[PDB]
Design an enzyme around this catalytic site. Structure first.
Site, PDB file in Angstrom:
ATOM      1  N   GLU A 163      -0.665   3.128   0.722  1.00  9.88           N
ATOM      2  CA  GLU A 163      -1.726   2.193   0.028  1.00  9.88           C
ATOM      3  C   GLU A 163      -2.483   1.094   1.073  1.00  9.88           C
ATOM      4  OE1 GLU A 163       0.870   0.559  -3.181  1.00  9.88           O
ATOM      5  OE2 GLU A 163       0.100   1.965  -4.535  1.00  9.88           O
ATOM      6  N   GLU A 351       3.639   7.929  -6.526  1.00 11.92           N
ATOM      7  CA  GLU A 351       4.122   6.711  -7.186  1.00 11.92           C
ATOM      8  C   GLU A 351       3.454   6.897  -8.580  1.00 11.92           C
ATOM      9  OE1 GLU A 351       3.798   2.862  -5.839  1.00 11.92           O
ATOM     10  OE2 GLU A 351       4.980   3.034  -3.931  1.00 11.92           O
TER      11      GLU A 351
END
Ligand code: NA
Ligand code: NA
Ligand code: NA
Ligand code: NA
Length: 444
Positions: A163, A351
């Site tokens: 991320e 995720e």
């Protein structure tokens, strides 16, 4: 007839600082998050990851627990401050933990997916400028090279960064995450050096030419909706879409930054870090893309501090993060990648999960039926992606266990396993029993 092939990887995910604890054991020094968590007010209730889930010490129990659920893959992160606790100083005891973790995983038929960087930058690096210093490309490259050399015969699936939107904009522009700066120009430069560091690792990884080994990156992605059909809200949606998604998807997969956003940002900050040689390194061919999906964004015209786009609450059910539950955007993003960016390249959901107010019953059970329904809805969209031709190779639920949720501290529980932090006892939530059954049946 399976909805998920026998080749499909049902997985779970963690991150080093969120679960390991043992924050100063066996040579580990501080990361920017140890430091941040000790700055007054920067982490809720002054929580920190000193102990967390104590996964560093309990890993054999945790791997056995994953074996008993049928888990086929485990995504974890490697703590840079354990491996190089000081600049140019390798720590064999830190490496030893990830070798014995990896050995336990392989003995239990669990395929390891290792995230190289998951936000725990060594403090010594940040004191030299951190991601604002172009030399971090070399420090990250040497760190990555050491992992490939020592672990590459046993870990075959590698993720460079988790991320980068969070490590750049959320950390340097909004300032919610470490190191907590609030400067758009700094965030833009950080995002570039993150991507360039990713490209250095890929270049190093290709040079080693390890057998049967794959490399990729993990991006948190959303889908942006305009609050109305007006031209102003559509422009706001374009800004939010470029801010979250296109600013990282375009350089990685098109070899250029989105030009509209270069122009937009350029009205407010410097964008002189862009050049052809850097973008060629950034856009190297990957073996897979990891997708982190949680929610969509609905945006209207305005400016409330960030850019010229204001996110609103559309009024539907939300998790305890305040994130709208909107499973259809998982399919939309995965199809958007297939159509515009990744084509037939393998994709992983690295995720997806939800935080709810979990309570242990008098009989020791956790009836987290909202998380069960959340996961059912999102696995159905993954099933629909596969049915429509998408190349989805696996699905990593966030998270294996409740853990340190960054600026929220321990106040947000994402796990399919409940953790009583007083005793470090693990308790299987109903979502874990449901996931065990899904893995066995592979139909939804
Ligand atoms: Na920790
Ligand atoms: Na603290
Ligand atoms: Na990770
Ligand atoms: Na690629």
């Amino acid at each position: 007839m399976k909805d998920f092939s026998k080749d499909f990887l049902f997985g779970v995910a963690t991150a080093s600082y969120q679960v390991e604890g043992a924050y100063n054991e066996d040579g580990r020094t501080m990361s920017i998050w140890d430091t941040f968590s000790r700055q007054d007010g920067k982490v809720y209730k002054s929580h920190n990851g000193d102990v967390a889930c104590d996964h560093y010490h309990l890993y054999k129990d945790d791997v056995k627990m994953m074996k008993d659920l049928g888990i086929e893959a485990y995504r974890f992160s490697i703590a840079w401050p354990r491996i190089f606790p000081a600049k140019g100083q390798y720590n064999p005891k830190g490496m030893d933990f990830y070798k014995r973790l990896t050995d336990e995983l392989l003995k239990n038929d669990i395929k390891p997916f290792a995230t190289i960087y998951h936000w725990d930058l060594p403090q010594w690096a940040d004191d030299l400028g951190g991601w604002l210093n172009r030399e971090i490309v070399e420090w990250y490259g040497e760190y990555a090279e050491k992992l490939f050399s020592e672990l590459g015969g046993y870990i075959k699936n590698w993720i460079t960064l988790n991320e980068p939107w969070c490590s750049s904009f959320l950390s340097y522009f909004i300032g919610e995450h470490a190191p907590g700066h609030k400067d758009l120009g700094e965030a833009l430069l950080v995002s570039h050096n993150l991507l360039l560091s990713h490209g250095k690792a890929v270049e190093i990884f290709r040079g080693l030419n390890l057998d049967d080994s794959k490399i990729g990156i993990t991006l948190n992605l959303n889908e942006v909706f305009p609050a109305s059909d007006s031209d102003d809200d559509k422009v706001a949606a374009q800004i939010a879409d470029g801010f979250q998604n296109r600013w990282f998807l375009d350089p990685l997969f098109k070899g250029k930054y989105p030009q509209d956003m270069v122009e937009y940002f350029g009205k407010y900050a410097k964008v002189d870090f862009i050049n052809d040689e850097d973008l060629k390194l950034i856009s190297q061919k990957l073996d897979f893309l990891g997708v982190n999906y949680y929610t969509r964004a609905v945006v209207q015209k305005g400016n409330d501090g960030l850019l010229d786009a204001v996110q609103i609450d559309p009024g539907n059910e939300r998790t305890e993060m305040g994130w709208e539950i909107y499973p259809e955007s998982l399919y939309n993003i995965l199809m958007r990648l297939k159509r515009e960016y990744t084509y037939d390249m393998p994709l992983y959901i690295t995720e997806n999960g939800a935080a709810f107010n979990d309570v242990v019953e008098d009989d020791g059970r956790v009836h987290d039926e909202k998380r069960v329904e959340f996961l059912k809805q999102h696995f159905k969209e993954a099933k629909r992606f596969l049915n429509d031709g998408g190349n989805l190779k696996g699905y990593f639920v966030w998270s294996l266990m409740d853990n340190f949720e960054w600026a929220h501290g321990y106040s947000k529980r994402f796990g399919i396993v409940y953790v009583d932090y007083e005793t470090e006892k693990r308790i299987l939530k109903d979502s874990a029993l449901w996931y065990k059954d899904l893995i066995s049946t592979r139909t939804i």
